[PDB]
Design a protein around this ligand. Sequence first.
Ligand SMILES: CCC(CC)NC(=O)C[C@@H](C(=O)NC[C@@H](O)[C@H](Cc1ccccc1)NC(=O)[C@@H](NC(=O)c1ccc2ccccc2n1)[C@@H](C)O)C(C)(C)C
Lengths: 99, 99
Amino acid sequence: PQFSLWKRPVVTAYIEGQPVEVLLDTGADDSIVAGIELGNNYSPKIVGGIGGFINTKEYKNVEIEVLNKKVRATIMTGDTPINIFGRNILTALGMSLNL
Amino acid sequence: PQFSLWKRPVVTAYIEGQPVEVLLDTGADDSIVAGIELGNNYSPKIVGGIGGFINTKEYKNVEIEVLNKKVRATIMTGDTPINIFGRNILTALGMSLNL
Ligand SMILES: CCC(CC)NC(=O)C[C@@H](C(=O)NC[C@@H](O)[C@H](Cc1ccccc1)NC(=O)[C@@H](NC(=O)c1ccc2ccccc2n1)[C@@H](C)O)C(C)(C)C
């Protein structure tokens, strides 16, 4: 699957079985999701954007299913308007930017 | 060119002859750059991400040479910690996201 960027590259993934829409982001070093419960086992992390900082709850070894593919990675959780799949997940999946 | 996503997909662009290092970003709707004087006629705007928003200057029909191509597009200027080329530019170069 090849995505032209005319529209945002958005897909449906299941995080630990819960379905969500995520933006596949080659401009995010990290993945951050909002409104899903991931559990008690996390670490406070502080994160940056264009806008400014945000504090997140950091989950590791999270079961992800996206694009007919199974991965495990670090998910952070927080106040994010759109949910984002960064370069850590993208790499694990085998995606690439082409020209 | 293909960009594995292991490291940030960064490249050298010339914006009106000035060289710049930029982020190729599938999760950026707008293109935003710091430290170039693009001049006088612009339009007052805002740009936001994670953490919040910032004040920008919107210029139109800027000349850019990147990836061995020549485009003309809108670039904002503002105090971004990293220069970003969003989907508006990527779409002009004919870049795609693949798996
Ligand atoms: C360290 C943790 C990670 C967390 C993502 N942060 C980074 O890797 C830093 C990194 C970064 O923040 N990358 C993510 C960026 O790619 C984010 C992703 C995104 C999309 C949509 C909504 C929110 C956020 N995009 C952006 O910052 C661009 N934003 C948007 O396209 C965008 C779209 C819709 C929105 C709706 C409401 C509020 C904000 C909205 N922002 C901006 C350039 O125009 C730098 C500063 C280098 C670009």
